[PDB]
Amino acid sequence: GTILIDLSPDDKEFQSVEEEMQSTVREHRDGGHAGGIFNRYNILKIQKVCNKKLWERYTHRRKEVSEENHNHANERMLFHGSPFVNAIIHKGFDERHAYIGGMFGAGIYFAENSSKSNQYVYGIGGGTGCPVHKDRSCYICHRQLLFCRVTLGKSFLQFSAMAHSPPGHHSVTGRPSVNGLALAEYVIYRGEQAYPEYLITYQIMRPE
Ligand SMILES: Cc1c[nH]c(=O)c2cccc(N)c12
Ligand SMILES: [Zn+2]
C-alpha cells in the first residue's frame, strides 16, 4: 500500500523538513558513542510516505484522542530512529517498534532532537554501528530517520534526569531536568498514534 514520493530540494516542503533535521542537532552526553560525532548532516533524499490505510488508521485514532481532550489532538512532528524503518513505512507503527527497556516503559519513542533519534538508527545505544563497517560514527554509510506526525493528546509530564499510558493520559513527555540543551522526548503506547510522514536519507558529517 505504501508509495514513496521523492521531494525536490527546490520544494518548500523539502527545505522545511531539512531545516528541522539540521536545526535540532545537539551534542550528546555520550560524546558521540551511540550516534557518532557530527554537528550537521548531508541530506541525500527526502521522501513523502503515502499509505491510505495507515493514514486513515492515524486520523481515526487522532479523532478519538481529540474528542477525549477538548478537541485537541496535541499533534507534533517528531523524529524516530530505528533499524526497522522499512517495516514501519510499509506496515505502520506497532508493538514490535516499542522500546521495552525505555525509561518511560514499553512504548514507541520519539524525539524533538533529530540527533537523539540518530542514536537509535543502528539499534539501542547505536548497536554495533553501520552494517558494513561496524562504525557507530560512520561518515560513509547512508542512514535513514523518520519525521512523523504524532498525536500526544493529554501527555503525562515526567521531569527526567506494549505498556499502557498513565491512566487519564494519551502519551508521556520526558522533559529534560539536567541537560539544559536537550529537547523533549515523547512516548506513545498505541501504534495508531503516529504516521511516518517523511523518510529522510542522510549521512552524518565529520566536523571540520
Ligand atoms: C528508543 C528510541 C528509539 N528511536 C527514537 O527515535 C528515540 C527517540 C528518543 C528517545 C528514544 N528512546 C528513542
Ligand atoms: Zn559504514
Swiss-Prot record:
Tissue expression pattern: Highly expressed in placenta, skeletal muscle, liver, brain, kidney, heart, thymus, spinal cord, lung, peripheral blood leukocytes, pancreas, lymph nodes, spleen, prostate, testis, ovary, small intestine, colon, mammary gland, breast and breast carcinoma, and in common-type meningioma. Highly expressed in fetal liver, heart and brain.
Subcellular location: Cytoplasm; Golgi apparatus membrane; Nucleus; Chromosome, Telomere
Domain of life: Eukaryota
PARP catalytic domain location: 8-208
Binding, Zn(2+): C130, H133, C138, C141
Modification(s) after translation: Ubiquitinated at 'Lys-48' and 'Lys-63' by RNF146 when auto-poly-ADP-ribosylated; this leads to degradation. Deubiquitinated by USP25; leading to stabilization. ADP-ribosylated (-auto). Poly-ADP-ribosylated protein is recognized by RNF146, followed by ubiquitination.
Assembly and binders: Oligomerizes and associates with TNKS. Interacts with the cytoplasmic domain of LNPEP/Otase in SLC2A4/GLUT4-vesicles. Binds to the N-terminus of Grb14 and TRF1 with its ankyrin repeat region. Interacts with HIF1AN. Interacts with RNF146; this interaction leads to ubiquitination and proteasomal degradation. Interacts with NUMA1.
Function: Poly-ADP-ribosyltransferase involved in various processes such as Wnt signaling pathway, telomere length and vesicle trafficking. Acts as an activator of the Wnt signaling pathway by mediating poly-ADP-ribosylation of AXIN1 and AXIN2, 2 key components of the beta-catenin destruction complex: poly-ADP-ribosylated target proteins are recognized by RNF146, which mediates their ubiquitination and subsequent degradation. Also mediates poly-ADP-ribosylation of BLZF1 and CASC3, followed by recruitment of RNF146 and subsequent ubiquitination.
Family: Belongs to the ARTD/PARP family.
Name this polypeptide is given: Poly [ADP-ribose] polymerase tankyrase-2
Species: Homo sapiens (Human)
Lineage: Eukaryota, Metazoa, Chordata, Craniata, Vertebrata
Gene field: TNKS2
Residues of the full protein shown: 952 to 1161 of 1166
